[PDB]
Amino acid sequence: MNLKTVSGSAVELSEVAFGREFNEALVHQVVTAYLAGGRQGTRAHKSRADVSGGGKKPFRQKGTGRARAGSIRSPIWVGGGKTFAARPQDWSQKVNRKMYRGAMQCILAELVRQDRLVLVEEFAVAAPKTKELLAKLNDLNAARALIVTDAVDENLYLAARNLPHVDVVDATAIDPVSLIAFDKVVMSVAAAKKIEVELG
Template sequence: MNLNTVNGQTLEVSEVAFGREFNEALIHQVVLSFLSNGKQGTKAQKTRADVRGGGKKPWKQKGSGRARAGTRSSPIWRSGGVTFAAKPHVSEQKVNRKMYRAAMASILSELVRQERLVVVDSISIEEPKTKQFKAWLAANSLEGKVFVVQEEITENVYLGARNLVNVALSDVLALDPVTLVNADKVVVEVAALRKIEEMFS
């Protein structure tokens, strides 16, 4: 199959990487796995058993006129434990390499079908300035959430784009399914495209 660059050049690319059928279930599984594996899993709170104190009964069961109480660590007391306390846990979801590659190829293919994949020869920014990078985006009619993929991120592009909230940068090896799915436009340099084709074919 063929892809056209912004400059009108026609590139022949692998149909396995850029012409695959859309597999929503597989993409969903891979995206969930990516998000789950990104969690730190160290959130922790104290239950009534973990908080300090609470050993002695605060007052006798009957006769005081107050509500009965067995421990100061009860969740309904101030400085008591948390009722359903969070505990550290690993939420890792494994996806094998074949499934991951198939999902990434499916995402890339859908980007091509929806004309959200923009191929450029190279991103030429003379100086590391946000103004210049914004001008480059405007010149190529790139609006909304823009995901820029280079074979290796150049210093001028990194420094020019880092203050822009709607622009994300990545090299080929750090591609992730979530950013690809969320982007309105994915800008890929030709050198990066060839590397992606090699990875997911």
């Protein structure tokens, strides 16, 4: 497949990595799996065994005219245990290797055909200056963007740290949620070639 960088240069990118038909069900499964894997899952409750006290029978089985009770920490009572007390949970899901790769290929192709991927021959900053990076992005008309480079320069990372709606990542660290969340993806040609070799 043939693509056009912002300066008019021509780039050849494989159809497997950047031209796969969009599979919404696959993409949705992988994205929701990533979001679920982001969970921490730290919490707990106290069951009727965990609540303080409550060991003795409050009153005798028959003769008092009350409803029969076995413990004051019964889940029916105010201040008693929770019926089904929670424990910390692990929310990670398994994603098949091929399914993850196919979802990433679909995402990249859909970005290309929606014109949210912008290719550049080189993307570097001379100094770690937020204003420098801001002007550079305003030139390309990508003020809200995810920048993908073959390697992350320290100056570029420092310049991008404080900008809202801008993040910079390595070509080997792209993730499906971040590819979708940002308005545009600005990718260097070297990073595009590395992603081509990885095939998404």
